[PDB]
Amino acid sequence: GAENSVACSNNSIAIPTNFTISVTTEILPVSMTKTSVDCTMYICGDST
């Protein structure tokens, strides 16, 4: 990041004067692929 200054005191308050609204996207994996395998015909070729 960038280096900021550390200032410490006894009684100081910083009630804000103006405000900025900014919107961002947040992305979550939720569900997944409905994979179902017929176990008999899959394993060792197309013969039963």
Q: Which of residues 15-34 bind other proteins (CB under 8 A)?
A: 15-33
Contact between 47 and other proteins per CB under 8 A: yes
- What does the block give as tokens for 1? 């990041």
Contact between 40 and other proteins per CB under 8 A: no
Cα separation, 1 vs 46, whole angstroms:
59
Cα separation, 22 vs 44, whole angstroms:
57
Q: Least distance to other proteins from the beta carbon of 22, Å?
A: 6
Binding site for other proteins (CB under 8 A): 1-33, 35, 41, 44-47
